[PDB]
Amino acid sequence: NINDRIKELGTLIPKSNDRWNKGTILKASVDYIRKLQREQQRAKELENRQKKLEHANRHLLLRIQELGIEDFLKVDLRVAKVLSAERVEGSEKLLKLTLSLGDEERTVVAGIAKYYTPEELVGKKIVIVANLKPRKIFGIESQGMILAASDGENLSVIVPDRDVKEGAKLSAAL
Amino acid sequence: NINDRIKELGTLIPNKGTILKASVDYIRKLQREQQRAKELENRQKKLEHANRHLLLRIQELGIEDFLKVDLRVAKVLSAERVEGSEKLLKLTLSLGDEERTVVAGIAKYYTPEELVGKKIVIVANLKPRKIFGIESQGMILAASDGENLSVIVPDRDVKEGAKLSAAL
Q1: Which residues contact B138 (CB under 8 A, 6 or more apart)?
Q2: Nearest to A5 among B1, B20, B41 (CB)
Q3: Mind telling me which PANTHER family this protein's record contains (chain A) (predicted)?
């Protein structure tokens, strides 16, 4: 009832290595508590610095990843229209896209051959990066590049919600 | 003292058996919450590394951003006030190799007579911006305090078109 609980306090209290009375085993208790009280309060004050540092770290990712208008304007995203698509012989991954920006016709290469059929591409309004650097592929020049979104399993080209005249430049204005 | 110091345990936690039994609970609780702090004290060890890596990255990012700016000394060749505007000055500037044209908004703070001839620091790479009829290839550095506008000039004399460099 009482002595067992005081004896229990003896178990939780660290090794005394000293007399086993009743008051002594109770004295250490208020000592133990007071110390633990001090520790947690010092640790609790420390945690506030960690959170203050937590946000501070995040806020530094924003700063380092910030885009800016002018940097963005250097990237020219425009809606295109597919004219034809043919599978490349000797490759089960590449498709040669013929695109229409209204005025300029472009030749792009895409890896969606497994995920996309030429028949379903013709007529589709896909978004591309026109400015993007040509990378010679299979002895063929890929003028501009195609935007994609991949989970690894699922491949997806990008499309405007409504239909729009081919060639429209994507803006972030208002 | 036994009862009085037990009573002290009453002031500790925010009937003799009740608070005694309420003490072991406070103990067991504290014996857990402290065991966590030792992990959170090692958590904040990794967050110390994070701040370290990001700053050095920002530092490198900061230095890289500076070298993008090609600060070059130019020499005013002409200065004529723009017509219909009381704030603009079209300035022809020799850099020693090619004479660029630059508009400056320092009309109210300067006379063309006092200006012409002085070797001033400008921003070279700055994109050419057309300002009502003139194609300014770069822009000039001017300090403003609200009371005084001041163009920027090297302390000693140096060859025109010199590349203003910071140390590193």
Answers
A1: B100, B102, B122, B123, B124, B125, B126, B128
A2: B20
A3: TRNA-AMINOACYLATION COFACTOR ARC1 FAMILY MEMBER (PTHR11586), TRNA-BINDING DOMAIN-CONTAINING PROTEIN (PTHR11586:SF37)
Distances (CA, A) of B141 to A14, A111, B122: 71, 50, 5
CB contact under 8 A, A27 and B5: yes
Q: Which residues of B touch A (CB under 8 A)?
A: 1-2, 5-6, 8-9, 12, 17, 20-21, 23-24, 26-28, 30-31, 33-34, 37, 40-41, 43-44, 47, 50-51, 54-55, 57-58, 61
Helix axes A23-65, B2-12, angle to 10 degrees: 20
Contact A33 B30 (CB under 8 A): yes
Which residue of chain A has the CA closest to B8?
A30
**Rounded CA gap, A60 and A52, in Å?**
13
Helix (H) / strand (E) element for B151: namely strand B149-151
The shortest CB-CB distance from A12 to any of B21, B24, B33 is to B24
Bridge partner list, A81: A100, A125
Q: Which ranges constitute the DSSP H helices of A66-174?
A: 69-73, 118-121
Residue A84, beta-bridge partner list: A98
**Which domains does chain A show, CATH number per domain?**
2-65 (4.10.280.10), 71-169 (2.40.50.140)
CA-wise closest residue to B123 among B82, B97, B151: B151
Residue of B nearest to A43 (CA): B37
Q: How many angstroms separate the CA of residue B52 from the nearest CA in chain A? A: 10
Residue type, B144: S
Print burial letters for A133-163: b (CB count within 10 Å at least 16), e (below 16): eeeeeeeeebbbbbbeeeeeeebebeeeeee
Radius of gyration of chain B (CA): 34
The number of C-alpha atoms within 13 Å of B118 and in the hemisphere containing its C-beta is 19
